[PDB]
Design a protein around this ligand. Structure first.
Ligand SMILES: [Mg+2]
Ligand SMILES: [Mg+2]
Ligand SMILES: [Mg+2]
Ligand SMILES: [Mg+2]
Ligand SMILES: [Mg+2]
Ligand SMILES: [Mg+2]
Ligand SMILES: [Mg+2]
Ligand SMILES: [Mg+2]
Ligand SMILES: [Mg+2]
Ligand SMILES: [Mg+2]
Ligand SMILES: [Mg+2]
Ligand SMILES: [Mg+2]
Lengths: 79, 158, 283, 120, 51, 50
RNA sequence: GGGAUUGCUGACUGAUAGUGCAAACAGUACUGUGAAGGAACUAAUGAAACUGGGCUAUAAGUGCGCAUUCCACCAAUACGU
RNA sequence: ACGUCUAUUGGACCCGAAACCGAUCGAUCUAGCGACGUGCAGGUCUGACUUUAAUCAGGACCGAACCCGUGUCUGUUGCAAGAGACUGGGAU
């Protein structure tokens, strides 16, 4: 009867009929061109005077290893 | 298996404005996917030697950022990225008619297309590699040119 | 965005580079590094040496006292500081900018019409009052108000007229002998705070404004005297609405619960600043 | 360096670079965090190469996209393309590396695991 | 081996952001990865002010 | 006056009337959603998507 | 009373029947603003209506797959293979 | 007791109302209200203010954009489950 319980049952019902977006989901997929849906991005800042300011600690940093060249493990193991 | 949840337009309207995180960690084990599209064969020969192009277009997932694509290319592939331009695309609709005629309709997963403009690596900048004619003569020739024909119809024979 | 442990590295780097004692160096490293100053080493050194090279060019300018008295001088370029005090000095041929750049960091940005005209209008606005000189040396770095870009000289004229209207000009002159930060308040907000103080600290009757206007007017004048004496004793009592207009009584009872009633406390609070701890407890 | 995703560069010549299999979880449990970090980066770059290479050809992946493209099950000579088989092995390797990392994160005792679940 | 990996908050070695990862818990970051987060926007302004 | 065109489309009004949140805002809307679930409808509300 | 496994259970039904659905995706397509309503479609065989032309004018065998009971190993108490 | 035929209670040989009682969904059509915003070509008359002057009023008049639908004709499984043409009414 609670609000969260109804939403959880809706999501469990939507767990079935999932995968590559068949049926009604083909039309419902076009809601992203109709109501400005925000995608799964991480926000890097905030507007103060309408000019966006990217906070430098929220800029993306990738900890790549020192050398991936002549490293002795490949993505494939011999049979 | 846990997968993509349904979202609701009223829910994103009500619980709106995602906030920036308080801390950002350097990303060990990143989950980010890029792929090129088709290149012209002369561009493919341009990549085969010296490994460079001024403009390369990529397919990504729509949860990425221009900063993330620029940082990933600079960090992993050693490139110099000047600017990124991102386009959000819908999936293609697919039709796969069944044993009884049903018109089974699919939709590909939504993708983001990035246009990445590159920069010459170090000292190699000569490979930008490009008489006159008056623009008054250009416009006057393009005004006396024959018009484009109207588009034929798919049943029409010409 | 700071690298973890950069605070110790910056404190050590300031000692290893330009001469500065560790306590004021820690003030630059910690207190004035929430913003207000760039955190980069090899950039504070360049500006500090460049501002150290401006002490001969200006007669009363000491770099160390100026950078500690107001630490936002180093977030601007040293050439801009040189031009800013030069142009402000031409708009104020009087006490030199060197003793004044260490108290006011406002003329780094809006010097030309701003600091000179506001200072001239404030000196004339207090000279047309009962003999107030208003030399600029007494100004504190919290006096960004009444000098910031956006207050008109007419607004200062209205502010001093309202200050000598809300307080009596003998009381306003005694109030302005200490802590000129009362000029920062707008006249409507200053009127609101003084009326709320007169309501809560009403010595005439109850917490309500007792003795409404022969002897009722005498009690009302005594209430105006008591609030102006508290303002002379402490300028921070004018900052009551930051807590609330109705929490002035709450802070007064937080002081009241210990021993006795109101009349003993009107004598006690006028003799010692017991309200500062109560306001800090409310914050 | 765009040659890395630009092509296999061994496929235009008629030779096969990878003739092997994908990593398994029991072998991946024996590798250290640094070795798993380097293998993860090498495997993601291999994933970008294989996705680009099967994007130049018009061949599906995942065996669920094949139903969408109306391509028959098994008897199509498309599941037998080398790039698709390598792509499935690379996805298995990345999934198994993720599974090993959460197993090691769940195998801890103090607040170090709250930091171990922040880099995975 | 689990013999190493113990809580080592001070294994920094003090390199601009190669100490950030082992402070958040790391052998060697690539120079290209640190080149991606540009460290020369303030350096050019410092050099121009010095000259 | 010709009839038949009572449906004037608007995304704001459609989501604000028959969306998830107005259904969840009231108890009887929540039993409407519950019997939509018990019937087995693939689309729970007019604004659901993924 | 209710929710899932099993039925050497059925003088129950056998695709206009039996659940609304035996099906690649049935509470689907589709209808309606909405609550809500809500189909058809198995594999062979190929009746009639209908429309053109013509005319008239030996209740058995043999193979496989299991189930029952014998046997010999059994957890040794229902059979375990 | 079985078999058959009647009878009673059940929906009780089948199909068919207008109904009544509850509690879901609907002001995206339409009626009223409320908040914010926008529009009213060209002229005509009357009253007022100021005039070295680039202002206002009238449920004013004629008349486009716009709103409505008086009369006639066409149409009547129509272009349209209420439309078209020409005349019309309002248009600060
Ligand atoms: Mg854009
Ligand atoms: Mg009309
Ligand atoms: Mg309709
Ligand atoms: Mg049936
Ligand atoms: Mg049938
Ligand atoms: Mg039936
Ligand atoms: Mg059949
Ligand atoms: Mg026949
Ligand atoms: Mg009988
Ligand atoms: Mg309603
Ligand atoms: Mg008209
Ligand atoms: Mg008329």
């Amino acid at each position: 009867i609670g609000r969260e319980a109804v939403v959880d049952l809706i999501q469990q019902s939507a767990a079935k009929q999932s995968g590559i977006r068949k049926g009604w989901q083909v039309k419902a997929a076009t809601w992203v061109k109709r109501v400005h849906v925000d995608r799964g991005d991480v926000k890097v800042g905030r507007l103060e005077g309408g000019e966006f300011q990217v906070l430098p600690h929220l800029r993306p940093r990738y900890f790549v290893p020192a050398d991936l060249d002549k490293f002795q493990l490949k993505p494939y193991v011999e049979v | 298996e846990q997968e993509t949840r349904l979202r609701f337009v009223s829910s994103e309207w009500r619980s709106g404005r995602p906030q920036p995180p308080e801390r950002r960690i350097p990303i060990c084990f990143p989950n980010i996917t890029l792929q090129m599209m088709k290149l012209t064969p002369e561009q493919m020969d341009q990549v085969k030697e010296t490994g460079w192009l001024r403009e390369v277009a990529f397919k990504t997932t729509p949860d990425v950022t221009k900063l993330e694509i620029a940082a990933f290319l600079q960090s992993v592939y050693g490139m110099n990225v000047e600017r990124v331009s991102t386009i959000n695309y819908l999936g293609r609709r697919r039709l796969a008619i069944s044993r009884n005629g049903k018109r089974l309709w699919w939709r590909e997963d939504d993708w983001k297309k990035a246009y990445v403009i590159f920069r010459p690596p170090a000292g190699q900048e000569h490979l930008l590699t490009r008489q006159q004619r008056p623009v008054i003569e250009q416009i006057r020739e393009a005004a006396r040119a024959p018009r484009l024909p109207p588009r034929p119809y798919p049943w029409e024979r010409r | 965005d700071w690298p973890p442990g950069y605070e110790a590295l910056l404190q050590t780097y300031l000692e290893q580079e330009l001469p500065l004692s560790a306590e004021e160096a820690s003030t630059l490293v910690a207190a004035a590094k929430k913003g207000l100053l760039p955190g980069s080493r090899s950039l504070i050194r360049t500006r500090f040496m460049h501002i150290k090279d401006l002490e001969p060019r200006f007669p009363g300018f000491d770099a160390r006292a100026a950078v500690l008295g107001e630490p936002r001088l180093l977030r601007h370029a040293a050439d801009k500081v040189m031009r800013a005090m030069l142009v402000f000095q031409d708009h104020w041929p009087s006490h030199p900018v060197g003793p004044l750049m260490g108290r006011i960091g406002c003329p780094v940005i809006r010097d030309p019409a701003g600091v000179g005209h506001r200072l001239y209008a404030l000196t004339r606005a207090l000279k047309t009052d009962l003999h107030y000189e208003l030399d600029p040396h007494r100004l504190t770095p919290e006096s960004e108000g009444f000098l910031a870009s956006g207050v008109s000289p007419f607004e200062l004229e209205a502010r001093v007229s309202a200050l000598v209207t809300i307080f009596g000009r003998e009381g306003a002159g005694r109030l302005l002998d200490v802590s000129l930060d009362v000029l920062t308040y707008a006249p409507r907000d200053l009127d609101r705070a003084v009326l709320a103080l007169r309501e809560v600290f009403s010595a005439a009757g109850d917490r309500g404004y007792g003795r409404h206007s022969p002897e009722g007017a005498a009690a009302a004048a005594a209430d105006r005297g008591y609030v102006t004496d508290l303002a002379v004793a402490w300028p921070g009592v004018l900052a009551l609405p930051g807590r609330l207009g109705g929490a002035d009584g709450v802070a007064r009872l937080l002081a009241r619960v210990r021993r006795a009633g109101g009349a003993r406390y009107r004598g006690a609070v006028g003799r010692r600043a017991l309200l500062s701890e109560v306001l800090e407890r409310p914050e | 360096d765009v040659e890395n995703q630009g092509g296999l560069a061994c496929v235009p010549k008629p030779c096969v670079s990878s003739t092997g299999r994908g990593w398994k979880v029991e072998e991946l449990r024996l590798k250290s965090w640094q070795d798993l970090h380097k293998l993860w980066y090498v495997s993601l770059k291999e994933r970008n190469l294989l996705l680009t290479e099967m994007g130049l050809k018009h061949i599906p992946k995942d065996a669920a996209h094949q139903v969408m493209r109306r391509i028959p099950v098994g008897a199509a000579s498309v599941e037998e393309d080398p790039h698709r088989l390598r792509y499935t092995e690379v996805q298995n390797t990345l999934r198994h590396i993720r599974q090993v990392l959460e197993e090691r994160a769940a195998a801890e005792l103090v607040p170090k695991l709250r930091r171990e679940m922040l880099e995975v | 081996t689990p013999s190493a990996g113990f809580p080592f908050r001070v294994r920094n070695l003090e390199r601009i952001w190669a100490e950030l990862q082992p402070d958040a818990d790391x052998x060697x970051x690539x120079x290209x990865x640190x080149x991606x987060x540009x460290x020369x926007x303030x350096x050019x302004x410092x050099x121009x002010x010095x000259x | 006056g010709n009839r038949g065109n009572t449906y004037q489309p608007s995304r704001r009004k459609r989501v604000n009337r028959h969306g998830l949140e107005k259904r969840l805002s009231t108890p009887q809307g929540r039993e409407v959603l519950l019997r939509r679930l018990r019937k087995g409808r693939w689309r729970i509300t007019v604004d659901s998507f993924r």
